C-alpha cells in the first residue's frame, strides 16, 4: 500500500515510517504540506493513504487535504496530533499496534 505520510518531527516519522515499511507498505516521507502537495501531484491517483500531522510549520494538515485532496481521489486520509469523507483521527504519542491496525482498517 502506497502511504503519504507528512510530519515534521523527523525522528517520529522516521520511525512510524520505517515500521510501515516493515509491514510492507510504501512509505513516501513528507516533512511539511508544501512538500506533500508536490508528492500528491507527482503520484495522483496512486496513494492509497494520506497519514499527516495536524499542526506542522506551514500550512496544517487539513489545509493540506483541501488542497491535495483531488490528487488523493477517494484515498482516505488519517490525521494525527498531540492535540470531507474518509477522515479518521489518531492521537500522538503512537502506539505502532495501532498505528499498523487503522491503516490495515483504512486500506481494507
Partial sequence: ????????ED???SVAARLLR?????????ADGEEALI?????????DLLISDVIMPGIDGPTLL???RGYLGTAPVMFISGYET???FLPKPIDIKTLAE??????Q
Avoid: M, P, S
Wanted: proline share 0%; net charge positive; charged share 30%.
Fill in 86 to 88: 474518509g477522515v479518521t
Fill in 11 to 13: 525522528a517520529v516519522r
Fill in 22 to 30: 516493515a509491514r510492507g507498505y510504501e512509505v513516501l516521507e513528507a
Fill in 102 to 107: 487503522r491503516v490495515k482498517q483504512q486500506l
Fill in 66 to 68: 483541501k488542497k491535495a
Fill in 39 to 47: 508528492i500528491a501531484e507527482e503520484n495522483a491517483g496512486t496513494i
Fill in 1 to 8: 500500500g502506497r502511504i503519504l505520510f507528512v510530519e515534521d
